[PDB]
Design a protein around this ligand. Structure first.
Ligand SMILES: [Mg+2]
Length: 50
DNA sequence: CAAACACACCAAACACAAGAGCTAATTGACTGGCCGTTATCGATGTATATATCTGACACGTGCCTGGAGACTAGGGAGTAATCCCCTTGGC
């Protein structure tokens, strides 16, 4: 999720993949819904426990 | 005249002002009265240090008594002769 959640397409599930360096990554096509810009954005990540 | 409602106006409040995310730094109560502990000032000593006076011992000076010195007066102690009393000695 990205902090300003304007519409439904702003909190979608994803499958986890662990990569060496310390930065969230996501395919560029999925940038448009979130309205992210990879210019120092921040995007939250919640995990269900059930 | 008094009471009903309606309208325009004035006066008084309520709540909102996107989602959030990170970092920094300024504020660290205070006079006063009073009780409770404790430090200090004060008296009332008894122990020890020092000063004055009295007592015993020491060195020194002294007043007094008796002893000692030089010199004197004049007579006590004492040679040298004599008598003859009396003792020792004898048959
Ligand atoms: Mg951007």
């Amino acid at each position: 999720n990205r902090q300003p959640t304007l519409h439904k397409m702003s909190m979608m599930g994803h499958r986890v993949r662990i990569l060496p360096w310390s930065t969230f990554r996501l395919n560029l096509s999925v940038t448009t819904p979130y309205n992210a810009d990879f210019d120092g954005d921040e995007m939250n990540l919640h995990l269900p426990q059930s």
